[PDB]
Amino acid sequence: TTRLTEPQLRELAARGAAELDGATATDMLRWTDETFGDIWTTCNYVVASNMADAVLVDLAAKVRPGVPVIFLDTGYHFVETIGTRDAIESVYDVRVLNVTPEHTVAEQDELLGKDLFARNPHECCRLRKVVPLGKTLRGYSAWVTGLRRVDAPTRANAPLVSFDETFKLVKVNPLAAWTDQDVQEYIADNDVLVNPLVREGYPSIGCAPCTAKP
């Protein structure tokens, strides 16, 4: 494998969380790149995005050109989300990776009942998001997400750096301390791309069947 050892990863996550207490998003990404950078697509840390905007993508490309960015194409996405994905891949200096489940929508419908998302959403999410994400992250020692502590009351204590137990690696959230005004001013000052559905009155953007219509 190409993963770092579990105790090594836990100690690195602890040292990073202690050392980056109160750092800006760029400082966290700089530390991540300095730690897991070598030994441009030949990288040891990856960035994850839901294609709702290109804030974290812009930052990661500014600190590391050609950085890999994973997108979980569950086959239930909006056409606008796939269009935003393509736009970010064409514009930004980023290596995009289309993480797809091994079974298509039609295949899963025929093998486990049509529209499995409506009959059991947890298993659909596990099959099309969690399992492919884990199979892809096997190989990377750390991964970066655009999680903000304001996303939910349960996310209020989201750490800057920690050890993700679900995939057993290092998880760093640069946008954790960011507020809505923060991301708004950043998008304004940097002219970064935004999913059209966000402009069309959508709080969050996920799979088409499991997104609350306004």
Ligand code: SF4
């Ligand atoms: S959000 Fe809905 S459609 Fe998308 S993977 Fe989860 S259960 Fe399936």
